Design a protein around this nucleic acid. Structure first.
Ligand code: MG
Ligand code: SR
Length: 119
RNA sequence: CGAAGCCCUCACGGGCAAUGUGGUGUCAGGGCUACCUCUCAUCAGCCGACCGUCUUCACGAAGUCUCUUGGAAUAGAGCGU
């Protein structure tokens, strides 16, 4: 809410979570806010995911401003448990990162482009 | 480093845990990279006392002889242990 500056449509989110499921089974992904933050800093992040229902908002608060000064694209997910299932976890995840995509590189590229147009 | 983890249950199974269980590390700073050497430190865990002290208990030597006084010798005098 405080870190959210744009509303991502349900259709764009469906595409994004589908792309994340094939990103773990082919390439590699990072699960958890700590591992997402280190990826943006180490530069090894292609597309970063962040949940909208994070209480407290502090945990994830930094991701939008950090990704902007590191050129890493980001997208918002409405629910926390859906991002966890998409990353391949029984639990939820406040944030996930795609560390080098796999057979989804063409999809991720377009998702990164659809978000830039949405400001 | 990143689920490699913890709890309940005989098990089955359940619960916890990416908002981080668990590994590493804690100023002889540590970590990462590159090598040298090596450990007996530390932490976890097993076993598990002596002595001493306090209390309680068992065992444990040698006269109940003489005379006088006395209601009564545990007294006096005598002899003995
Ligand atoms: Mg430790
Ligand atoms: Sr949760």
């Amino acid at each position: 809410p405080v870190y959210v500056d744009f509303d991502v449509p349900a259709d764009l989110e469906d595409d994004a979570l589908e792309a994340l499921e094939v990103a773990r089974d082919t390439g590699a992904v990072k699960k958890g806010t700590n591992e997402t933050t280190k990826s943006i800093e180490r530069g090894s992040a292609e597309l970063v995911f962040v949940a909208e229902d994070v209480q407290p908002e502090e945990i994830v608060m930094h991701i939008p401003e950090l990704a902007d000064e590191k050129g890493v694209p980001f997208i918002f997910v409405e629910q926390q448990d859906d991002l966890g299932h998409a990353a391949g976890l029984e639990v939820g995840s406040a944030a996930a990162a795609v560390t080098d995509a796999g057979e989804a590189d063409a999809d991720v590229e377009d998702i990164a482009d659809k978000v830039e147009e949405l400001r």
